[PDB]
Amino acid sequence: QMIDVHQLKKSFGSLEVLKGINVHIREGEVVVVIGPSGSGKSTFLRCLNLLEDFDEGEIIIDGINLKAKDTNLNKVREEVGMVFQRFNLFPHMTVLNNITLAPMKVRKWPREKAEAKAMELLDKVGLKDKAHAYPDSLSGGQAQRVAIARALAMEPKIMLFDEPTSALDPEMVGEVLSVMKQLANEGMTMVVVTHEMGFAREVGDRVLFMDGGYIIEEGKPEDLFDRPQHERTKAFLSKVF
Amino acid sequence: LQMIDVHQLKKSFGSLEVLKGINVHIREGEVVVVIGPSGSGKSTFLRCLNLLEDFDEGEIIIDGINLKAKDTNLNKVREEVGMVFQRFNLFPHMTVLNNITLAPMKVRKWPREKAEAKAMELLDKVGLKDKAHAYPDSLSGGQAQRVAIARALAMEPKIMLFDEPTSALDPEMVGEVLSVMKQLANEGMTMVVVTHEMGFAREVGDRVLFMDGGYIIEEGKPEDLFDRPQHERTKAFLSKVF
Ligand SMILES: Nc1ncnc2c1ncn2[C@@H]1O[C@H](COP(=O)(O)OP(=O)(O)O)[C@@H](O)[C@H]1O
Ligand SMILES: Nc1ncnc2c1ncn2[C@@H]1O[C@H](COP(=O)(O)OP(=O)(O)O)[C@@H](O)[C@H]1O
Ligand SMILES: [Mg+2]
Ligand SMILES: [Mg+2]
């Protein structure tokens, strides 16, 4: 009941990007999403984060129905964090200020409280000493960890990841995946669009393969990667792994 | 008149002096390149000019306005001073087009129709009008940085600050960005550019400032400072990838 989607459809003009998506993710589940570009993976995530609107079907995030009147969108918005492939940081402010901005403005937390918690989070990602540094001095691996710390600072119940390490140098991937695994080990509800097989196998509860606007196949990590049942899945897997 | 005026500017982070007192005067139309080793205060200096950070001593005046003058007119400076960073220039949670129109609409009350109109032209100006409806996660470094520029220009600023806009790009994409900056320069835009791309400096730089440890060690026209450096430290820094 954490994330419930029924026959979701979305189009950009006369190009149908999502052609009827069905997904039901319960609290604590870690769902990995794979598939070629153009399959609507990001669009799907963007819909769950209220960053994009959808045409048909419906979405229910932890009870609250997104297209129902009443509701209150901004409440859902804040219990769902998101980490993108790139960016995620204000280059004009310190690491610390990047993390406390939303908790102060949206949760009206006094600066001292927000910072004490930011420091804690920064410490848990191994970067407490980067607190007063600006984003430019950080490496790709540190920057993405700060970006996760920032999304976590709002204390969300759902964490969305859109290829968080695909743009990183191989050496930087690990430090980022580790934080994600800890987040997984700690029971967070996660949806992760990634092509990092290792991560999927270790903490992924289920893998959904998206292609051409549909979820072509599902399964436990090793079942889908090693025993793909659909022809399209096998073809795509052999182009990546 | 003089666009940027900086009398013995000093900055300290606690008991650690970053800018040991520097003097700079940039007039309307000037392209000043700032080079120097890391940890010399190049970035701190830019953040001061862009009200992003506070300075201890000296004074600063951006187009008449004295940055720390009582009955403030400094948020009209913010709209006149545009800046592009090395990384993190765009919001990934929104489209290209929406990144560019966010400030004009918000800060200057521009009507959605108007804002998106000039935005499309700017995108065209950087060779990316078809990316108007794309998301940042799909662009290349070169493109992303050309869009970041278009974004800052959306506010029609008087001054453009660039903090190593290509230092994080693959050699292949460095060119398209410098080219967009080359263009801004030809059009008479007042610019302060921190870079290590000496070719750009030579071709577009009116003046070059060599910073080292919080001080401006050497100044002068590009060709003179590049070919015939007068100071040892300037020679030493320029010897790294000669
Ligand atoms: N605003 C838009 N207008 C038109 N087409 C769009 C728009 N946004 C995205 N698209 C296109 O629709 C499809 C969306 O794909 P996407 O959600 O990015 O899936 P993926 O994350 O697997 O690449 C792609 O073809 C994308 O380029
Ligand atoms: N918040 C801070 N506290 C202490 N030192 C800082 C802080 N921010 C920057 N510095 C230091 O100021 C010095 C100059 O930084 P900077 O302006 O970024 O130089 P460059 O831009 O030439 O690398 C460096 O030693 C940098 O680490
Ligand atoms: Mg995508
Ligand atoms: Mg710097």
Q: Where are the domains of chain A?
A: 1-241
What resolution in angstroms does the PDB record give?
Answer: 2.2
* A-to-B residue pairs, Cβ atoms closer than 8 angstroms: 54
In whole angstroms, what separates CA A58 from the centre of its chain? 20
Q: How far apart are CA A161 and CA B106, in angstroms?
A: 29
In the CATH hierarchy, which top-level class contains the domain A1-241?
alpha beta
In terms of Cβ atoms closer than 10 Å to its own Cβ (0-12, 13-18, 19+), residue B21 is middle
Q: How far apart are CA A21 and CA B84, in angstroms?
A: 39
Residue of chain B whose alpha carbon sits nearest to that of A38: B138
Question: b vs e for B45-75, b when ≥16 Cβ sit within 10 Å of the residue's Cβ?
Answer: bbbbbbbbbebeebebbbbeeebeeeeeeee
State whether the beta carbon of B42 lies less than 6 angstroms from ligand 2: yes
H or E segment and range at residue A6: strand A3-11
Which residues line ligand 1 at a C-beta cut-off of 6 Å?
A: A 12, 17, 35, 37-43; B 133
A193 Cα–ligand 1 center, Å: 15
If DSSP codes are grouped into helix, strand and coil, which group holds residue A115?
helix
Choose which CATH entry (3.40.50.300, 3.20.20.60, 3.40.605.10, 3.30.1300.10) describes domain B1-242. Answer: 3.40.50.300
Query: Of B93, B115, B114, which Cα lies nearest the Cα of B103?
Result: B115
State whether the beta carbon of B13 lies less than 6 angstroms from ligand 2: yes
Backbone angles phi, psi at A211, to 5 degrees: -160, 130
* Ligand with smallest separation from the Cα of A97: 2
State whether the beta carbon of B18 lies less than 6 angstroms from ligand 2: yes
The atom number, within ligand 2, closest to the CA of B43 reads 21
When computed from its CA atoms, the radius of gyration of chain A, rounded to whole angstroms, is 18
Calculate how close chain A gets to B230, using CA atoms only, in Å.
30
Alpha carbons within 13 angstroms on the beta-carbon side of residue B219 total 10
B206 Cα–ligand 1 center, Å: 43
A217 Cα–ligand 1 center, Å: 21
Question: b vs e for B200-238, b when ≥16 Cβ sit within 10 Å of the residue's Cβ?
Answer: bbbebbbbbbbbbebbbbbbbebeebbeebeeebbeebb
Residue with CA nearest ligand 2 atom 24: B39
Q: A25 is written with which tokens? A: 């993710």
Residue with CA nearest ligand 1 atom 13: A38
The atom number, within ligand 2, closest to the CA of B45 reads 17
State whether the beta carbon of B41 lies less than 6 angstroms from ligand 2: yes
Which residues in chain A (175-234) have CB-CB distances under 8 A to chain B? none
A13 lies within 8 A of chain B by CB: no
Q: How far apart are CA B226 and CA B242, in angstroms?
A: 10
A193 Cα–ligand 3 center, Å: 9
Alpha carbons within 13 angstroms on the beta-carbon side of residue A131 total 14
The minimal CB distance from A92 to the residues B52, B92, B144 is found for B52
Q: How far apart are CA A165 and CA A198, in angstroms?
A: 13
Q: How far apart are CA B143 and CA B126, in angstroms?
A: 9
Residue with CA nearest ligand 2 atom 5: B13
Calculate how close chain A gets to B227, using CA atoms only, in Å.
30
The minimal CB distance from A87 to the residues B50, B92, B164 is found for B92
Asked if residue B163 lies in contact with residue B191, where contact means CB atoms within 8 angstroms, the answer is: no
Residue with CA nearest ligand 2 atom 26: B39
Q: How far apart are CA B124 and CA A200, in angstroms?
A: 41
Backbone angles phi, psi at A64, to 5 degrees: -60, 120
Q: Are strands B159-163 and B190-194 parallel, antiparallel or unpaired?
A: parallel
- Which residue of A93, A134, A161 is the best one to mutate when testing the B interface, meaning the one whose CB has the most B CBs within 10 A? A134
In terms of Cβ atoms closer than 10 Å to its own Cβ (0-12, 13-18, 19+), residue A110 is exposed
Are A49 and B133 within 8 A, CB to CB? no
Query: Of B67, B125, B130, which Cα lies nearest the Cα of B96?
Result: B130
A40 Cα–ligand 3 center, Å: 7
